[PDB]
Amino acid sequence: AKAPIRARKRVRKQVSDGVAHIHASFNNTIVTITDRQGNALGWATAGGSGFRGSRKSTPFAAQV
RNA sequence: CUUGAGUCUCGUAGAGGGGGGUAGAAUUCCAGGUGUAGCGGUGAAAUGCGUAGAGAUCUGGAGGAAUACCGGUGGCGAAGG
């Protein structure tokens, strides 16, 4: 038996479609993609994307 | 005496008052789903909120307060309003 592949041969969902809900808040920005029924599938933030209080409120921090 | 003053007829606009009712919108709160480690507050944060499952997103339920637009040096009330 040889060594295994570098990248996965299979993937557990393929839901194709969703809605990005943004709460661009006065001190931060929070972005969440949810399926069309509003059950959330995955998310990320300004402040969690490597910015503290002083930077997390900017469109450049939100862009990331 | 009718001219001041008063009165009815009649035309008429009004967020004027008191009593009651109502629709939708929203901030909040509760439950639960989905999801997953972030959230928050300031000049900076700190205090504070999270993984005992937050934030964000969906749906059910709950409360109490107030009427966005219209809106104008506009209209109405003795003034307070």
Which DSSP string corresponds to A8-47?
A: -S--S------EEEEE--SS--EEEEE-TTS-EEEEEETT
Identify the experimental approach: cryo-EM
Report how far residue A15's alpha carbon sits from residue A34's, in angstroms, rounded to the nearest whole number: 11
Q: How long is the CA A60 to C1' B29 vector, in angstroms?
A: 35
Q: Compute CA distances A38 → A7, A11, A20, whole Å.
A: 31, 22, 10
Report how far residue A47's alpha carbon sits from residue A43's, in angstroms, rounded to the nearest whole number: 12
Strand B nucleotides where any atom sits below 7 Å of a protein CB: 33-45, 54-59
Q: How long is the CA A3 to C1' B36 vector, in angstroms?
A: 33
Q: How long is the CA A61 to C1' B14 vector, in angstroms?
A: 55
Q: How many CB atoms lie within 10 A of CB A29?
A: 23
Contact yes or no for A57/A45 (Cβ under 8 A): no
